[PDB]
């Protein structure tokens, strides 16, 4: 650029642009115009008494809201010109924490002074890390209630213990009200970590819930959910999903007065019939003599533990031998392996993606071009403005069809959130999700086991399929979830747009959910082929030069003729093919490129396409508080 004053002018212009962007971003959150700053609080250790920190933290003006069990309140101050909504959550409670930490603007972790955190705190913190962290602030409780010689050493040991999870972060202690004011000032001005899934949809936290039943006997009525819009512009015609109770359509949006203004009845919209999205998760439209033989006629409680140990032995025999399945000597091999075919190479051999599809794909939806549709939908979300309710407004939502028990849950203490979806999201498809195993659990998990999924504001039980995470057209089925591999879970589910965090839990015992896997959502398509491989092994027992006689791979004569076009490979690296069967039993002649060792073993690979099971149901049981054994 040269000309020093012009270079400094360029730098000043870039400074002003970045300053304008930052100041525009920081005006949206926790103020006169924007929605209230939601702060969730988790005490990581059991020795921490949360109500002491809550009465220390409440004092501006407080408005003590209440529920059945939890006690969350509303904070307002014009000294900092800032508006807060403080909520509490207890670790181990998977339901409440994972359901309402996905809407909080700032999480406040509480740490006991002596030890870092409890085991339940570690489990909850792993779940929060895996689900997507908002801006987090670390805070401690019992530092000032110690002698000074112990105070300094306690802070040193605590900062040593924190470093394994939070690498470098400052700790703000809370014992006095002045320290609480400093912490409030810290939370008011923070570098916000923006979560994408919250930003691309229209989420809402239920500040008040009312129920108007149409009929008591039907147990069906209208919900009146009043709260602050925090995502995108809330549109009535879009569908609404409640995180634990499914997706369904809305009726009306009205705007009452704001009960909590920073510096102190009319309806907005009713739904049209045609423009409203239709709730349809699946497709609507479905001569010989008497005695002579043929040879001459040619001339003319503890059961679960036993199953668990059997699963351990199956996993041990699956890792030390990858996919070798024994040929049954009772059933013919061409009958039990009727649907299996041989591929010349797993990467390059052709396979039609629409060749033999089950009747379950006749019930799902596909995308002609998923990337283009996602880009167009996101462009219509960000670049376009819709006439719905803006963010920061206190609105009431009349939702037509809900069950009664949801309202009952809101009176038990469980938080309620509801988010407005993107178009073409209520439909069902086949999600492909990349997940790796958490080291916390070591339970063996087969392919089609029944697991609970937290896939980006959704919760559903399902039976996935596990595959290699490759770039090829074909992906081999993994019969077990390997610890260090990153695998792909493929299962029927309602379709959602990435980015989305994915959690895989397992119902262990007594309603205790065990986190077994975590990851994110890859591109969604049912065209991702999952291939189950079966390896048949045979023993070469007569070895000559370049050809051999092999037994025990089959047991009939026509079984060898059935699998003749499939080539054989060898554990010591030889490649060959079957020439001719000789015995009436499963003896066969095999030619190879080299000479086989006497220590050697021939084997062939057979391939089939496997499709996931349809075990989708949105109902998931409420977890008990988590505890170690």
């Amino acid at each position: 650029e040269l000309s020093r004053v012009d270079q400094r002018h360029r730098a000043s212009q870039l400074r002003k642009q970045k300053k304008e962007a930052v100041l525009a971003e920081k005006r949206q959150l926790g103020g006169k115009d924007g929605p209230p700053h939601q702060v969730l609080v988790v005490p990581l250790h059991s020795r921490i008494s949360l109500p002491e920190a809550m009465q220390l933290l409440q004092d501006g003006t407080v408005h003590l809201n209440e529920l059945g069990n939890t006690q969350n309140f509303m904070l307002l101050c014009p000294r900092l010109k800032h508006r807060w909504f403080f909520t509490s959550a207890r670790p181990g409670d998977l339901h409440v924490v994972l359901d309402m930490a996905k809407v909080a603007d700032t999480i406040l972790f509480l740490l006991d002074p002596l030890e870092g955190w409890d085991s339940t705190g570690d489990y909850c913190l792993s779940c929060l890390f895996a689900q997507g962290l908002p801006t987090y602030t670390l805070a401690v409780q019992g530092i000032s209630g110690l002698p000074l010689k112990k105070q300094i050493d306690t802070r040193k040991k605590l900062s040593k213990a924190v470093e394994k999870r939070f690498p470098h972060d400052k700790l703000l202690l809370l014992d006095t009200q002045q320290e609480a004011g400093m912490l409030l000032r810290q939370l008011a001005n923070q570098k916000q970590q923006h979560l994408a899934f919250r930003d691309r949809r229209a989420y809402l936290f239920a500040h008040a819930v009312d129920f108007v039943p149409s009929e008591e006997n039907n147990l069906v009525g209208t919900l009146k959910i009043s709260g602050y819009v925090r995502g995108q512009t809330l549109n009535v015609n879009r569908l609404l999903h409640i995180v634990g109770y499914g997706d369904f359509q809305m009726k009306q949006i009205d705007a009452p007065g704001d009960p909590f203004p920073l510096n102190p009845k009319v309806l907005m919209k009713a739904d049209p019939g045609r423009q409203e999205s239709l709730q349809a998760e699946v497709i609507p439209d479905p001569k010989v003599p008497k005695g002579t033989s043929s040879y001459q006629a040619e001339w003319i409680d503890e059961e679960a533990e036993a199953k668990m140990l059997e699963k351990y032995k199956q996993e041990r025999l699956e890792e030390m031998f990858p996919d070798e399945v024994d040929t049954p000597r009772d059933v013919a091999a061409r009958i039990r392996f009727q649907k299996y075919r041989g591929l010349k190479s797993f990467r390059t051999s052709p396979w039609d993606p629409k060749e033999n599809l089950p009747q379950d794909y006749a019930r799902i939806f596909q995308f002609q071009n998923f990337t283009n549709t996602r880009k167009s939908i996101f462009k219509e979300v960000e670049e376009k403005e819709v006439e719905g309710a803006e963010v920061g407004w206190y609105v009431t939502l009349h939702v037509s069809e809900v069950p009664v028990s949801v309202v009952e849950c809101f009176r038990q203490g469980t938080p309620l959130i509801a988010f407005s979806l993107l178009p073409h999201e209520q439909k069902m498809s086949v999600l492909n999700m990349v997940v790796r195993r958490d080291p916390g659990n070591t339970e063996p998990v087969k392919a089609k086991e029944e697991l609970i999924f937290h896939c980006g504001f959704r919760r559903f039980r399902a039976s996935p399929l596990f595959s290699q995470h490759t770039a090829a057209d074909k992906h081999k089925l993994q019969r077990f979830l390997t610890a260090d591999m990153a695998l792909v879970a493929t299962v029927y589910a309602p379709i959602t747009f990435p980015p989305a965090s994915v959690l895989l839990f397992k119902q262990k015992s007594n309603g205790m959910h065990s986190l077994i896997a975590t990851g994110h959502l890859m591109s969604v398509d049912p065209d991702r082929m999952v291939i189950k491989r079966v390896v048949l092994s045979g023993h070469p027992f007569k070895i000559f030069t370049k050809m051999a006689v092999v037994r025990y791979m089959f047991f009939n004569r026509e079984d060898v003729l059935w699998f003749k076009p499939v080539e054989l490979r060898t554990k010591w690296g030889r490649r060959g093919h079957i020439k001719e069967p000789l015995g009436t039993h499963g003896h066969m002649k095999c030619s190879f490129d080299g000479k086989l060792k006497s220590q050697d073993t021939v084997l062939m690979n057979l391939y089939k396409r496997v499709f996931p099971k349809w075990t989708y149901d949105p109902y998931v049981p409420e977890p008990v508080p988590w505890l170690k054994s």
């Binding site: 060749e355 009747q359 002609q368 071009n369 549709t373 059935w562």
Partner: peptide
């Protein structure tokens, strides 16, 4: 009748067009 199949192309899922 060894590694031969017919495999007719039926029951495809409905696709959302762009």
């Amino acid at each position: 009748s060894i590694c031969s199949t017919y495999s007719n192309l039926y029951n495809h899922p409905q696709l959302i067009k762009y």
